[model samples]
Target: ADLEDNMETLNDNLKVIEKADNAAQVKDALTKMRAAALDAQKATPPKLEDKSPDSPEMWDFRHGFDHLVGHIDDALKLANEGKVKEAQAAAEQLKCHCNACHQKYR
Candidate 1:
């Protein structure tokens, strides 16, 4: 339930970042999302402790959580530099990661 809540919050922040018209807005959204992701990461089940390797829920949560942090880091860097196109591309890259992770896990 905690993971689900965090995932929803991250997704909401992602949408805001995606539609942001300016660097400041994007940066703000990205900052919020990044912090949320970090917090979620801290709460995630430890990889070695997971008992169900084949469980879809486990797989999706692990992959999605990692991908979100990585992608958001890249996107935030680009956004901070005012590189809109690059940031958008990074965002798309993150989306692909989300889709691929979901396909394999969820």
Candidate 2:
């Protein structure tokens, strides 16, 4: 899938935050995550190859992407405020979102 690298980047950055001790590292990791997620949103997932772009399934896929970006943005907002623990806590749900999306379309 075209999103593979972008997904990997997200995973890597997630790990960065998982082990992060300060706001700067969290902010840096989330910055990259936000960029990768926004970039990945423009591409379609492989599982939806046969579906029309405007179909409900595609809409779900798009929603999933946006949901992910929303979380990343929220986490970044927390990081921006120097709330490292809160940002990490917000980011905690990211893996859940990833797993749900993967189960649906990966």
Candidate 3:
């Protein structure tokens, strides 16, 4: 259930990013991503809990989600500064994080 909700939010934010043609769109997408990240963080396992060492689920979901949010924020800043190429590059990097996390966790 948590995964479904997070994935939906992430997918929606990605669509917004992909369709972004201006600073406003980038800002909107980044906003969504940040909110989603906060929610994801809350869903993460508590610090004191012990899980299997090799479970990617224990690490990838939390850190990967945070990394994507950071990248989106960087992209938003670059977009706001009118550095479209740099913003796009950051977005591409964020997409790679998604792919990598999915490969390990999903």
Candidate 4:
């Protein structure tokens, strides 16, 4: 998703991920995060100003971005199992993918 569109979602979810004080809360947070990730990943890019949509770099980002959605799902499973720290790791990995794409295309 465009940064403006998803920025608040990211900020809010990050707070939950960072400050989760219990397993139930962590599970809820991870559930919300997974939803956000799915919503964000489903966003088709706007016509980018810097490059063609079909360009090699854009193609790579699009495909890799979808792959990161899988990472979110993985995190969800960890969160469900009460593996909060590992869930956070996967969440952060998801953040990396978000930042990477935004740095280039935003």
Write down the worst ten-residue block by lDDT for model 3.
Answer: 44-53
lDDT of 1 by residue, 1-106 (tens): 3656766776887788678787767778777777777676545454434556566666566667677888888888889899876786676676776676556534
Each candidate structure's count of clashing pairs = 0, 0, 0, 0
Query: Top lDDT: which candidate number?
Result: 2
Instruction: Provide the lowest-lDDT 10-residue window in model 4.
Output: 40-49
> What would the per-residue lDDT of candidate 3 be over residues 1-106, giving only the tens digit for each residue?
4746866887787777777787667777777777877786656444414666456666666777777777877888887887656665667677778788667545
lDDT tens digits, residue span 1-106, model 2: 3588898999999999999999889999989998888778878888888889999988887788799988988888899989999999988989899899889898
Cα-based lDDT at residue 2, candidate 2: 58
Candidate 3 pairs with clashing backbones: none
Better of 2 and 3 by lDDT: 2
User: Which residue runs does candidate 3 get wrong by more than 4 Å?
Assistant: 44-57
The TM-scores, one per candidate, come to 0.68, 0.92, 0.72, 0.69
Q: List candidate 4 stretches off by more than 4 Å.
A: 1-3, 44-61
The candidate, 2 or 4, that scores higher on TM-score is 2
Q: What CA root-mean-square deviation does each model show from the true structure?
A: 4.4, 1.5, 4.2, 3.0
lDDT at position 49, candidate 2: 85
Clashing pairs in 4: none
Clashing pairs in 2: none
lDDT of 3: 0.70
